[PDB]
Amino acid sequence: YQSVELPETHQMLLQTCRDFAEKELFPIAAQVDKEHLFPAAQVKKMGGLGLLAMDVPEELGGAGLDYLAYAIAMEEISRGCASTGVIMSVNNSLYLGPILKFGSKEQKQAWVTPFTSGDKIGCFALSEPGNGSDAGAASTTARAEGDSWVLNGTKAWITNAWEASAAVVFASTDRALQNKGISAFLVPMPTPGLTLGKKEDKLGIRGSSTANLIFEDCRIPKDSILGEPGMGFKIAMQTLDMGRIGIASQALGIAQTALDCAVNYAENRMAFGAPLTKLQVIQFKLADMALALESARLLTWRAAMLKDNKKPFIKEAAMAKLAASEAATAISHQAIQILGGMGYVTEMPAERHYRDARITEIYEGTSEIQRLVIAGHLLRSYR
Amino acid sequence: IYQSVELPETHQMLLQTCRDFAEKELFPIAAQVDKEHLFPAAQVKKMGGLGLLAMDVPEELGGAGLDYLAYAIAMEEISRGCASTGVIMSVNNSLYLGPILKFGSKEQKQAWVTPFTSGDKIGCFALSEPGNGSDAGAASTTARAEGDSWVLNGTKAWITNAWEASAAVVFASTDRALQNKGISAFLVPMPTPGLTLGKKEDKLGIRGSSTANLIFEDCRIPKDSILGEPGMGFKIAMQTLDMGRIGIASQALGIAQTALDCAVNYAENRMAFGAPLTKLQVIQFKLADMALALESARLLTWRAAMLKDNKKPFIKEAAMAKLAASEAATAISHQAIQILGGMGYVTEMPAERHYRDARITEIYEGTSEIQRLVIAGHLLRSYRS
Amino acid sequence: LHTIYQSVELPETHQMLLQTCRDFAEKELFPIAAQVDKEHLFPAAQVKKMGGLGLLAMDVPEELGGAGLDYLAYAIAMEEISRGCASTGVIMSVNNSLYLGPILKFGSKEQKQAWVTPFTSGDKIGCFALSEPGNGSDAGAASTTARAEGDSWVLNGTKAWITNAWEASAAVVFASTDRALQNKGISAFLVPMPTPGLTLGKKEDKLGIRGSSTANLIFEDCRIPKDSILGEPGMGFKIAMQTLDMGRIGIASQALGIAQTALDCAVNYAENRMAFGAPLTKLQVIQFKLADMALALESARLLTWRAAMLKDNKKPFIKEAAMAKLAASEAATAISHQAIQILGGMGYVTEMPAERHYRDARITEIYEGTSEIQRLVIAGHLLRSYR
Amino acid sequence: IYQSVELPETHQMLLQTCRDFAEKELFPIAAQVDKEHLFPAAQVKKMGGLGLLAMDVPEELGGAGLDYLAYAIAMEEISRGCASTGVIMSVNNSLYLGPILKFGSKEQKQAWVTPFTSGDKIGCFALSEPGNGSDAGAASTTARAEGDSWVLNGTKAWITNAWEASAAVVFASTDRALQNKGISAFLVPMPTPGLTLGKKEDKLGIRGSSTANLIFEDCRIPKDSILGEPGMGFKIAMQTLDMGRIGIASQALGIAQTALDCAVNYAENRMAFGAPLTKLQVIQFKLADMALALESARLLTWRAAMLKDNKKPFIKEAAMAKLAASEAATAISHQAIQILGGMGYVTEMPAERHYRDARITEIYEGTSEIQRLVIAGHLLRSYRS
């Protein structure tokens, strides 16, 4: 259930991840951001704990957990480091997720199992320079020739691009079929015909890598296709439905640690004779931050539990992602404000939380796309 | 319409029963109840027969033996039908029966609970006074012991069901020098010598409910009319409001849900620039924000109910739910008017009523500002723990 | 005319006009506002007194019986009057901007003498019939028609939502003279009330501005003289739009009055209500609400005065009038909502005026183009500016 | 662009001169200034030669002989180009020269204003301390009289231009018993014996300005370094802040404008779903809301500037301008990032920088919370008149 008693596997998992975060991520979070340093040693240890492959079956090397467990772990990890959070989220939902749900027995053996322990991680390449929200406009092409698919085109904004050893790539096998002409492919990295673009210099989550995947006469075997030709758009969308629960959970952790920072500070900063928490406006700020965060967690857990129970969860996932991301930006903004001048400098982690929060309103579907998704499903329920 | 969580089949069936009752008995009368300020007597009687006026009361006392999750679901479905009918039911459940269940004697429960579980008699809750609402502990109505009697003097203000209730849980200071350790709770019959009703308030909304002062002038009641012991009245009132706030949260969910229902149905059939309003992206975004606000507040509300059912602390969670639901009901009913356009402003559509009805949920059983104080205090305590 | 500095200190004539309308509102309007609302009573005697003061024809030349003032003066007066009574404000705003406005701007000298002059003294007022039951936000979709027949036009169709419908003696009516031309096939017509062919619909029962009448005008083969057309055929769409640009300044000013009187009520109440041992104004949350109310009100007024002065200075003001109407209308609802909240229980009942101010404010977000329409207007003109 | 009712020809030409300077000298360096946290010395010197560092300063003292309306327009156009350059400029104008001009002697103006009007030397303003920024009056840095000199002890905090300034206006307590009324203001050369600079702060934004503590240890200055009489320090600080808040409001206007500039050009040239972004209703509504927030905040700002120019009271008005402009800058820069999508999160575009620069305007020269307190105080005092 929801806060109303968690199962004890999930409660133990919560404490496990919270212990890992505070011991292994809190002391490195500031350096990862300032040095834009990929946290390889921390990622490997998380692999050992099963956090990089949580809903993956144990026979494939995964933890055998569920998406409520994933959501809890994503929050605790992201509370400690937002970049570490997104690295983990991409491996779980966006890379392993579609291969589990749509892959061959042999594709799972070759592409899931070597990516469950933290020695290798994957990435997800849907967006392109000309189109992100308009995912169905993918114009990277895949052409069948001989025993190969031949890939040509640029994918953009690919998280883990510089550290991953495989990608789920969406390319159009016939642009005239529009979002029925997209297919999904498993692409090893590195590979001939594939070049990495320059790393993006980002506002936040600076410990993750983000770079273009440039395909030029890139040949991969025919059986690299995930599913059948034309399934790619559905594969991408059902993958993002799961991924959005991950990003919602990341935002929950950014929000929680920004709120932790503000409460501790306000309890010890003195003004006009008393701690800041004696001022009414400060109490109201804290109350509204706690309300935004706790209700967005309820939405997140609802989406996660619907998925686990094999129920439709597209609208609920979108709601959780929208609510958590906007709450993470509003809470991190008010945490800066509560710190005052100290909110604006590196002596405190509030300015970093604000920068990290801002991305959760953009990737895996902007807040605008989330609102469209919610409207679409709301109206169908009334029909 | 929401697809949320794992409902027990008992509560799934209760939702359908209540929704069917509301659509069949409440929807046709909501406009008349509001426009004519008409207490919906026949429907309250019928709800009483169903167990809706005494949901959390044990069956051996005449109640339905349900839980507070069931109460929240019923309150939403009923208030969706009629916002006045909702509050009337919520007062009887949380604010009148609730404290007597939790603090009464055996003799008090069989005398003051059981006859108020079927819809032939309802009660009310009298804490606020003209000089003080939010500052509840400033109650200056007095109760003085004399002979075999308590003697009550003073005016309670804003009492919902004042003109239809047959009993009241009244809070009065047995010694004002003790401040909010000087309040006591009393069971008072209505009517009774020494008690006069003030004129009914002319309200913005919830027009079906009566609201009026209770004016005590040398009003004598039996010595054993006291609920609890002298001086625990303040805590009786606060623990009662903690439970009532889940009711008002659920009332706000109903208003919000029926305002959204109204907006969707209208936007699907109103044509503009060649097509239904639901083809306009701006209208889609309004509806999505309304659905999110509503479904968010319901999860908060259900959490507080389920927490109380599991005997866990729930003061902070009850206040969050009441706060979120009430501000959502005002926001959603505002945007439902807006989606209807000119028709949103006229009495032959229900949207302007929902907006008037919503507004009260931000005020009573503790204003939004009090809820934020309550939330902040408990949040801070949790961090010091 | 109008220096930039006059937005910061009014010309003495405008400062005098403010005090004069405020005195009038508090003496004549404050005592009756609640009655006008609860009884849905057209305030005929007060509109007459305002007509004698020039407030019903502020922009009208003195030569034609008007006050000979400008739109800055009109906005100041609309605020003070609406602070007294929101209904009286709208009634005054329709006559100034929506009825007289288009006739001064697009009429011949003959038409002004016949249709402006008898409507400048408060004995007759006008109205503006653009909306129809099937279309309020797209003016251009007028299905009411006007067909030429000899020395007459013949009007057929139902206009909807007409403020002053049950009290006006003339209407500016928009009708399609060429359906095929859509947007360029609309024309504007001066119509007498009563007149054969015209039936009034039932009055609408509304949330607020209850003192004003709102009803359909039903035209069934209704004939009017040929020179009733305002401008030339096809100009109706431009006339409606340019009229609504002026009218939006009037509605912004009405919203300012509703907001100001709601804020007046909240300050007086919070200063004299105690809680937890001190006035409400000692509570930090209350101070913040009041400050937020004042900011929203004062910036919306600066937007409104800007639009008025631009119009007075013969500059474009479509975007600026839309910003003013949008800002002031949303400020009126937010401020009136927070005034209720500051009053607590008293904010929900008729003992106090706060709940009425909430209901009155709600209309300003809808009429003369909803807030959504205002944002579309603002966006279109912002993009034109960058091009 | 926006509209204004006729600006004087003076100010129209100033706007164009300042916009030309910003687009030619500041736009090409803005990214480097931010990324390398590099003080824009050559540009500041050029601005000094134009009069921009001493705008409301009499020409006979080396200034431009302009007014605060002109200052607000120049602040906006400069900050539209570089938010760091804007604050460096705003500190010299309002925070350093302002109080010397308003409270200084003929001789103090000659020695402390004139050498700081041409960009060769700039000043700074030291009121905050590590333990108190909002609580102004709680200044624990002391200044004791020692015959014909003053001796200062204590640490001032968060001083912008600290590492580039040749003089500070420093506030220190000359009578700690007198609290609010025992503060004084002092003109301090930089560098000077007894003064040490803290390490530069590493900041979210305006990274081209320097920010550091000023540490006074037995720092001796002549007797006529005091501005005004002993005890006038708190008033000098508050009236200086009233002026500076118009400067920060204008800085925020320029950050807001350049963010909206970037979003409009981007949305007009980015396609999605077969059409430009500006064909989407939600994008149109964002842009309209950004435009409205910016233009109304500028009107509030110009009102405060003109009142000051006309020597009318302007405390509430400056606080409203600063509050509205600063919250607008954050909201507008936020929505600019959103309109750009992925491009809003990276240095390929300048939106992420604008987001970071805007954030400081809600904090310094009085947080939004303090601004609301100032507004509330003067509203109530006006009502009590």
Ligand SMILES: Cc1cc2nc3c(=O)[nH]c(=O)nc-3n(C[C@H](O)[C@H](O)[C@H](O)COP(=O)(O)OP(=O)(O)OC[C@H]3O[C@@H](n4cnc5c(N)ncnc54)[C@H](O)[C@@H]3O)c2cc1C
């Ligand atoms: C740090 C980072 C990491 C990323 N990692 C990945 C990754 O691993 N894999 C991957 O596939 N992608 C990734 N992306 C891409 C990301 O998902 C996109 O940025 C986003 O989904 C699409 O936005 P866009 O950048 O193309 O902007 P655009 O799609 O051009 O959107 C521009 C604006 O239009 C708005 N808009 C409003 N209404 C509509 C409407 N009806 N239709 C369309 N747009 C509308 C959008 O909300 C946005 O404000 C990443 C992006 C970032 C910034």
Ligand SMILES: Cc1cc2nc3c(=O)[nH]c(=O)nc-3n(C[C@H](O)[C@H](O)[C@H](O)COP(=O)(O)OP(=O)(O)OC[C@H]3O[C@@H](n4cnc5c(N)ncnc54)[C@H](O)[C@@H]3O)c2cc1C
């Ligand atoms: C329709 C209706 C029915 C009602 N029914 C009942 C009933 O059946 N039983 C009953 O007992 N009561 C009832 N009430 C009373 C109701 O609960 C009060 O109206 C409410 O608690 C607030 O009290 P007040 O009216 O005294 O406002 P005030 O307490 O005077 O409050 C005024 C303003 O100050 C604010 N404020 C107060 N204290 C603080 C603080 N410490 N910090 C910050 N802000 C503060 C408030 O939030 C509010 O905005 C009813 C009220 C209404 C309107």
Ligand SMILES: Cc1cc2nc3c(=O)[nH]c(=O)nc-3n(C[C@H](O)[C@H](O)[C@H](O)COP(=O)(O)OP(=O)(O)OC[C@H]3O[C@@H](n4cnc5c(N)ncnc54)[C@H](O)[C@@H]3O)c2cc1C
């Ligand atoms: C009290 C009152 C008095 C009135 N008085 C007058 C009068 O004197 N004269 C007169 O001519 N009219 C009058 N009206 C009509 C009024 O101007 C219209 O109500 C209003 O403009 C909206 O039209 P509508 O009611 O048809 O709503 P609709 O146009 O149906 O709009 C419904 C919803 O869709 C939105 N919408 C519509 N078009 C678009 C679009 N393109 N993009 C996005 N959203 C859109 C709207 O904003 C609204 O939320 C009055 C109305 C009222 C309530």
Ligand SMILES: Cc1cc2nc3c(=O)[nH]c(=O)nc-3n(C[C@H](O)[C@H](O)[C@H](O)COP(=O)(O)OP(=O)(O)OC[C@H]3O[C@@H](n4cnc5c(N)ncnc54)[C@H](O)[C@@H]3O)c2cc1C
């Ligand atoms: C980049 C930068 C440059 C600066 N430059 C200068 C400079 O040149 N000169 C200078 O003198 N200072 C300067 N400052 C200091 C700046 O003005 C202060 O940081 C600011 O006024 C807030 O004070 P504080 O940092 O001590 O925060 P605090 O006062 O500790 O504020 C903490 C929080 O409590 C709130 N709060 C405080 N008091 C109250 C109250 N009474 N009621 C309600 N809420 C309250 C605040 O609004 C804030 O949210 C600078 C700061 C920064 C970040």
Ligand SMILES: OC[C@H]1O[C@@H](c2ccc(Cl)c(Cc3ccc(O[C@H]4CCOC4)cc3)c2)[C@H](O)[C@@H](O)[C@@H]1O
């Ligand atoms: O990410 C997805 C997009 O990114 C695009 C992109 C767009 C404009 C520019 Cl100008 C650039 C150059 C650059 C500059 C600076 C860089 O590194 C440091 C140095 C200083 O600060 C940062 C790296 C790259 C790249 C790709 O071209 C596009 O196809 C993708 O849609």
